[PDB]
Each structure stands twice: as structure tokens, then as C-alpha cells.
Amino acid sequence: SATGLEVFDRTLHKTHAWLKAIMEELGTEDRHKAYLALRAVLHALRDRLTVEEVAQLAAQLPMLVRGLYYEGWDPTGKPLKERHKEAFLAHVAEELKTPSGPAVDPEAATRAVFKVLSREISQGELEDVLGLLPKELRALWPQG
Amino acid sequence: SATGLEVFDRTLHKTHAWLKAIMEELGTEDRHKAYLALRAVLHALRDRLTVEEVAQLAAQLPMLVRGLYYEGWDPTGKPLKERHKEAFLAHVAEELKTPSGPAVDPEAATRAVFKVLSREISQGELEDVLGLLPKELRALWPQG
Structure with missing residues (x-):
């Protein structure tokens, strides 16, 4: 099967x-672009959390x-805690690098993935994650 | 595709x-049995390692x-460090439980998965993992 x-x-x-x-949110027909977005955003978000989180x-x-x-x-490194949107987007952008600029616009990629995540994970986990993020980063999620 | x-x-x-x-090592045609073995053994091995490991x-x-x-x-729990083979196999057996006994013999499952792991991972990682295990558990690997 x-x-x-x-x-x-x-x-x-x-x-x-x-x-x-994620593809629908991005408005693209390129599956690989959606994959790159998921990958880059999950990694940037993950790095701001403690091992338990x-x-x-x-x-x-x-x-x-x-x-x-x-x-x-890398679980040994201290979780990233930059407060501004640009710092977080720069980390997302680091894994979207291609021969000619970012594969997907960093903010667009972030908003698309956060939107899908918020619909797929439990409300409890969503609230927990949001509570661990600075105001400028919470603004990237649909809840605001 | x-x-x-x-x-x-x-x-x-x-x-x-x-x-x-893993199926060849177990001598079975049941794909699900090989999956259960991989799952149960990886989890038992994982639990004996620190977060970094x-x-x-x-x-x-x-x-x-x-x-x-x-x-x-569960990264918050102290890594398991039982010295005897029976203790480790009991943990493997915990995830091989079915309505009527273990899905696969615990030791057979462990030896099959460790054999495949030793052939797939780098020599450096294999030596590192072996060095973290007690003698009775190293005996479960092909290197001995």
C-alpha cells in the first residue's frame, strides 16, 4: 500500500x-518549499525551548x-532567548538558504507553520508554547 | 513515487x-514483528543514556x-543503569507485550536490533555506546 x-x-x-x-497557507504548489518551511521553523522554535519543553x-x-x-x-546549548522578531526570523532564514536568497520568505514560512501547528497540537501545548515566547514572537501565531 | x-x-x-x-536476523516474514523489536530495543537503549548521549x-x-x-x-528521568541482562531485557519486554506473551523473544529482539545498529551507525558511535554499557549488556552486541 x-x-x-x-x-x-x-x-x-x-x-x-x-x-x-502548509502549502495552502504559503499559497504554493511546491511541496519541497513547504517541507523546508516546516523544517526551518520547527528547528528555530525547538532551539528556544529547554530539554523538557x-x-x-x-x-x-x-x-x-x-x-x-x-x-x-544540540541539547547542551542554552536555549535561545532573543526578544525581537528579526532575531528569530534570522534563525529560520538560516535553514532556508539556497543559491539565490531564502527559499521562502522567513516570516511567511513562520506564520504558515505556526498556523498549522496551532491547529494540530493540543490547546494545552499551544498555550504552554505561547507562554514561553516573547510578545513579538507570539504575534507570529494566529492567536496573537 | x-x-x-x-x-x-x-x-x-x-x-x-x-x-x-532486522527481519532476516529474527528469521521472520512478519514486518510488524521487526518494527516492534526496533521500537522496544531503541527505547530500552535510549533510556540508559544521558540527554547528550x-x-x-x-x-x-x-x-x-x-x-x-x-x-x-522522558528526558527528566535519571538514565537507567541496571547491571544485569534480565533487567534490560525486562524493559525491552515491556514494549513487546501482546494479549498472549511477548511479541518476540526479548533477547532475540535485542540481539537482532543491536546487530543491525552496529552495521548502520559509525564505528565511533558504536564504540561510544558500548563503552557506556555494563559487560552483560555489551555481550548482547556482535562485538561482545
């Missing part, structure tokens, strides 16, 4: 749903997305 | 290779396998 395993077919189905939603968010992500989320993670 | 994304098709291909190797091993796992690896992880 797909992978020969129901568990993997299930996570692929969920991940496809996430990417499709990182795992708590991971529990709300589909298996395949969780693997992407943890890619390149 | 599979997921519509080369990055995901690639991790599915690698994960399929891992599971196929957990992420270091994660870097050697294919994206999809990494998502499975991190499933249900």
Missing part, C-alpha cells in the same frame, strides 16, 4: 496532511515530523 | 533496509527511525 507497515502509512498520511496545509512538544508531532524536528538538535 | 518528496522517499528507503535486515545516537538514525526512537521519551 505504501511502506508495508500500517504504523508508517499512518504517519505518512498525517505528515502529508500537515505539508498540504522540547520533548513535550515532540509528543504532539507525528512520528515522521518528530524525526525531522529532532534533526541536528 | 511514494510521498511526493525525495527527502521522505529517501528515509523510507533507509528505514525499509533497516527493518528488512541520546541526541548523539539520534544523529546516526534515519529521519523516520529517529522519530520512532524519540517516541515517549
